[PDB]
Structure 1
Amino acid sequence: TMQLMPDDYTHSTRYVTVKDQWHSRNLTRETSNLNCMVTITTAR
Structure 2
Amino acid sequence: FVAYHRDSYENKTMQLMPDDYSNTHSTRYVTVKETS
Provide TM-score, normalisation by structure 1: 0.43
Pair member with larger Rg: 1
Provide TM-score, normalisation by structure 2: 0.49
